[PDB]
Amino acid sequence: AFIILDEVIKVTNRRVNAIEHVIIPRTENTIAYINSELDELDREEFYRLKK
Amino acid sequence: LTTAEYLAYQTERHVLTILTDMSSYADALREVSAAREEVPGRRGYPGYMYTDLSTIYERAGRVEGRNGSITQIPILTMPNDDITHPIPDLTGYITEGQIFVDRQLHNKGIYPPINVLPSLSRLMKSAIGEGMTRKDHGDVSNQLYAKYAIGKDAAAMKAVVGEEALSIEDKLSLEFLEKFEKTFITQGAYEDRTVFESLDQAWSLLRIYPKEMLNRISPKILDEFYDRA
Amino acid sequence: INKKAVEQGFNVKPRLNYNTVSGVNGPLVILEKVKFPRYNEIVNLTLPDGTVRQGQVLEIRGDRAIVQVFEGTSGIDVKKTTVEFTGESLRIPVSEDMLGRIFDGSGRPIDNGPKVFAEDYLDINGSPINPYARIYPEEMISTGVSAIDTMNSIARGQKIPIFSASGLPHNEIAAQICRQAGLVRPTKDVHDGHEENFSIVFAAMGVNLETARFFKQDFEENGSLERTSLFLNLANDPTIERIITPRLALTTAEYLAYQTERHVLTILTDMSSYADALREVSAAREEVPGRRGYPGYMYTDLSTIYERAGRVEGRNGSITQIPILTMPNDDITHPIPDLTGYITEGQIFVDRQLHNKGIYPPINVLPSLSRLMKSAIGEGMTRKDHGDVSNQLYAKYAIGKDAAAMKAVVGEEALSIEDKLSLEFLEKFEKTFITQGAYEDRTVFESLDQAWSLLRIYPKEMLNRISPKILDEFYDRA
Amino acid sequence: YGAIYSVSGPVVIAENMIGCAMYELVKVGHDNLVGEVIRIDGDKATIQVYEETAGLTVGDPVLRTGKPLSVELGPGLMETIYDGIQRPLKAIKEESQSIYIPRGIDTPALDRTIKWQFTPGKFQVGDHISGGDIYGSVFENSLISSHKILLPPRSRGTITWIAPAGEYTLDEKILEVEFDGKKSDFTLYHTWPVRVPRPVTEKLSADYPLLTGQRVLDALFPCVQGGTTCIPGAFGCGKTVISQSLSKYSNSDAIIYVGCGERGNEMAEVLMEFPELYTEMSGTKEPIMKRTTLVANTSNMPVAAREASIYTGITLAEYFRDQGKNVSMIADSSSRWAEALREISGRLGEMPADQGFPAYLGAKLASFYERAGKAVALGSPDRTGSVSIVAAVSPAGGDFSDPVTTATLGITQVFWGLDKKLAQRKHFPSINTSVSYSKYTNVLNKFYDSNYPEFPVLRDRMKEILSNAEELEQVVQLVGKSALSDSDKITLDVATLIKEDFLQQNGYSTYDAFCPIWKTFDMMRAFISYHDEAQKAVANGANWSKLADSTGDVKHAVSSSKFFEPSRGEKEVHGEFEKLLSTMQERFAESTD
Asked: Which intervals hold domain ATPase F1/V1/A1 complex alpha/beta subunit N-terminal (chain D) (predicted)?
């Protein structure tokens, strides 16, 4: 049980500190940088077309 | 493509057309469209690029009454290693397959660095089997694709969770994936191994698994070919 | 002897008053039939109620000129508003007497004193310096901050911003640096110490009134007021006008340094407000944007704001820029810090993580940099071990942070002995070396001795970066 | 004068409209709809009509008022309810007897029929007068005893006539000044452009605390009258107690409440609760409405009214500041005002800077929050007023990451972090101590050392003991309860006692409805002394369990310290607290044996 609990706690802490703490910044990067900038370029191009 | 059409459909030759860099063609089209102040379709590319790529690609294949054909194998570089880019996306929408050269596979030293998961041949289904290639080709290809996909999934899980959490199927999948990438995909630039040698090597790869877990192939093919050794 | 008498400034140039205002679109007002408009001419708006605002021409179109107004465009009437065309681009009345004077963001005195009895009218955003006539800055200044002197050191002539954020004590750090600034090897030209002090030019754009009072009070604290010129544009001041306050400060700094031959120390606080003013004017003008809505020319404009510092071939003056900027979300990939990182030579990072830890100054030295330290230190400057000690401190701090991260993922027990050494070094570092009194001044030699005391935690064998020659000389006592 | 040329949604172009200013409001159409000019093209001016324009006809005359968006400042705007553009909703309902607001209604913002008793000031005929000079006072209501009427800040001249003492209406002229020959008539009211900050002689540093009565924020995260505050406006966080405490028990001589774009139900709750809310001075004998004016906007109103709500509120607050009255402005939701700005920009087609917001949002917020602050009022006599802003923020997704809340947190010096979880557990006023902060603690050091010198060290000692207990909660959950040292358990129990009996305040109870600053400081002393005595005794004595079990009576006494009635008198309460501390010291001395 000590071996199993050590492995489980290590996996849980490792995930909560690396996997989640990289996936959440990964999603934030995706949205905030790429989706927002692509939408901004689309907005600029259609605004120029309207002009 | 016009000189290829002349040779294939008028002189009855078999033309293997190779287009060196379709990305440069797409960039030239984008430059012309931008200078034309036309409505962009995606990230500055013209909105009619679908029709232009259809015109370029569709002038291939065999036509009725002529003894010639055009086998078109264009080459295009994805700008950021992604299928989602407009060039490869619009290419795949009209083409009948693709061969994916994978950067991660190339960095591993494998040549040719062809990834089979994104690669496809949309008209391979009716070109293999009885009286053409060997009758196990389709099922062997299906089993290899399924095992490779399971190997990638198990490698991802092993990256996420421990190896012991993986089933025996998953460990066999990693073993098959390693031997597969190192021996079957890997091939010398001057080797020219026939499809029958490739099928025999594929069977030697598949014989890692027991008969029970080759579920994607018919029992007839399995009990005909598995024990040949 | 009188090279000065060739100015012929007595020429009277009458100015055209224009009532031909067609319309206003946001910060921009448009004139239809101006005659021979100038590219960057400054103009004077006269509101119907008699209020006088001023702005500069941005675009010219045949007989048409487009004018932005610094104080906003509320109230202009196409029937009763009159525009006066000066004929020259924006210029500041500059003199050596501006030291000790507090100015509005637009150069107007606000210390209840008189206007600048100018020795000359220097044009804003002057010409770039010839690269063939540039002196590479390699006179390190002893700021008294152990986090700054021993590692990412500052030379005389830096462009080194203090990266920070809202609520961080960047103002305190800037005040301490301005107070303790001084060469590590002073020239001792005069025993009275008159010219050994830095002249200071302070520009406050977009800051709240409390920050302006704090900086003014701190300059009154150190007897440095007579050596300071304050340009305070406050939060309630017009936002369109904030784009000239740093330019006015840089123009007066250039006059003081490359003409008066003083050693100017320029502080540009809250340049994020300047960047936001740039974004606002860009959105008003509706041109091609960059990342996160900032103008695509923001790189060049920020460079022109920054590149004005340095040292020239023939003059014995220098400008030492320390801009202060607030990252909106503690993000160093934001365009506001990213572009200034591309331009300036290094940065000083003020960390919220270290600030919440309670240490002062909260300088996260690992992401900070000093691009001109590589030649400002050595055998002749400071001490021969400076470079290797700084490199080893960087490497061991990085290893300590990595091992602290590994401590949370695999527990303390799995850490190797060198990892425990790294944690001990990081603890002692952050709480004995980075930590420094707000009025504590440490010479680079004292702080180097402290750095060696910290580095003596490790055995001599694993000090890989340090060269054997220096290691065999300094690792042991003395 | 003008004439309608083209209409499309809320924007109207008016031809032959030469001579109109930039933001000059105009009367659009036969309905006289109010609209603001936003672009000019020669004689053609672009008008942003506020209300619905579905009935406008090309050719309808449009008349220019000659002034920008201006609020009517004078007697009669107290105890009244306004919209964003200061329309008297009460008078709107009374004159029309209609459920809905009539389109194009033009009821005066100030009641022109009320006769106000006017007593003239020290200024006499022939004197020189400048902007902000009190030339008389008007008894508005029983609580605002003297509504000092002011010369408008932009006006000055030589007084040529003053109306004597008597009763006048807001249409009656009561002052004539001469400037460059031309005469000018001044009534009891004057209009001020809403967006230009109302000038002051000198803006001081706000150093007197904004005592609200809520012990947790009066002690841990104090605010200064003239400071800026940010609170979450999320649902059910309990911001109602904050608003009612600022409008009910604060030092403010007047209260400005603005509803930017709040939902209809919530605005109805506010508009019903405020009239039935009574003051504290002289023993709860007057309604706070006599001290409070409201700006109310439901979800669906003219978007320009929602955008100008906070500007109207801050202009009223500045007008009362120029009279020397410390005011506090409460914003129902700054996020709703930001949404109004975003929709205005979308209608104008401006370039979206950050998440669709305009690029000037940060500058607008900075300028608006810098409008606040203690300042010497313009003109003579030399009186000092102050405007403090308590603005609420409510992000749509609750991420607290959209630019408006980031700008508000960056600008505002004090943040009172109301939390969902604390309100769920019936803990009030539900201020999350861990996330809340106040940057006015350093400024208030002068006031503390002048009045309660021990206050700052007690405050940050309580801060650090609660932080230590918060981290030791995680330590306990990690290892086990028994692993704590005696001092650690002392810290834990002291923090729990604090959370139960100092931070938590019933508010509805008579004893803790309003906790004064001296009672707050005495409770600071009691709790900090309890922690220090326990720490010292255990450090130099026996186990903690026996001492705590034996000294539970002292813990109960310091718990009941919350129950001490402030109405008994400050001196009596201080003496009784001294008695409590004396008995505490004696009983701990007896126990440590």
From this structure: 4-66
Rounded distance, CA D277 to CA D284, Å?
10
Residues of A in contact with C292 (CB under 8 A): 36-37
- Best of C208, C215, C273 to mutate (most D CBs within 10 Å, chain D): C208
- Token pair belonging to C450: 């402290």
Nearest to C145 by CA among C450, C452, C443: C443
Distances (CA, A) of C363 to C163, C353, D32, D502: 9, 10, 61, 36
Q: D102 touching A, CB under 8 A?
A: no
The H or E element spanning position D451 is helix D445-451
CA atoms of C257 and C188, how far apart (whole Å): 19
**What is the three-state SS of C13-56?**
CCCEEECCEEEEECCEEEECCCCCCCCCEEEEEECCCCCEEEEE
User: Taking the alpha carbons of B156, B161, B163, B169 in that order, is the dihedral positive or negative?
Assistant: negative
Number of cross-chain residue pairs from C and D with Cβ atoms under 8 Å apart = 101
Gap between the Cα atoms of B189 and B179, Å rounded: 19
Assess whether chains D and C touch, using the rule of 3 or more C-beta pairs within 8 angstroms.
yes
DSSP strands (E only) in D233-291: 254-258
Smallest Cα–Cα separation from D498: which of D214, D216, D213? D216
Q: What angle do CA C414, C415, C421 make, to 5 degrees?
A: 160
Chain-chain contact of C408 with A17 (C-beta, under 8 angstroms): yes
Cβ-Cβ contacts under 8 Å, C167 against chain D: 410, 437, 439
For C382, the 3-state DSSP assignment is coil
Chain A contact set for C411 (CB, 8 A): 10
**Least CA distance to C405: which residue of chain A?**
A17
Does residue C474 contact residue C385 with C-beta atoms inside 8 Å?
yes
**CB pairs < 8 Å spanning A and B:** 9
Q: Which of C249, C63, C179 minimizes the C-alpha distance to C437?
A: C179
CA dihedral sign, ordered C67, C68, C71, C72: positive
SS3 B131: coil
The strand pair at D182-187 and D292-295 is best described as unpaired
Structure tokens at D561: 């310290």
Which of helix, strand or coil describes residue D274? coil
Distance between CA atoms of D86 and D315, rounded to whole angstroms?
Answer: 11
Q: Among D230, D195, D226, which residue's Cα sits nearest to residue D404?
A: D230
Q: Would the annotation count D238 as a binding residue?
A: yes
Which of D237, D239, D233, D236 lies closest to D212 in space, CA to CA? D239
Chain C residues near any Cβ of chain A (below 8 Å): 286, 288-289, 291-293, 405, 408-411
Of A11, A41, A49, the CB nearest to B161: A11
Task: Tell the burial category of C260 from Cβ atoms under 10 Å away from its Cβ (0-12, 13-18, 19+).
Answer: middle
Beta bridge partners of D214: none
D23 vs C74: CB contact, 8 Å cut-off? yes
Question: CB neighbours (10 Å) of residue C220?
Answer: 11
**Signed CA dihedral, B92, B94, B95, B96: sign only:** positive
DSSP for D171-222, written as a single string: TSEEEEEEETTEEEEEES-EEEESSSPPPEEEE----SB---S-HHHHHTS-
Within 13 Å and on the Cβ side, how many CA atoms surround D10? 21
Q: How was this structure determined?
A: cryo-EM
User: What are the boundaries of each domain within chain D?
Assistant: 1-69, 70-113+187-438, 114-186, 439-593
Separation between Cα atoms, residue C177 and residue C175, nearest integer Å: 5
User: Which of residues 55 through 84 in chain D touch C, CB cutoff 8 A?
Assistant: 68
Indicate the burial class of D476 (C-beta count within 10 angstroms; 0-12, 13-18, 19 or more): middle
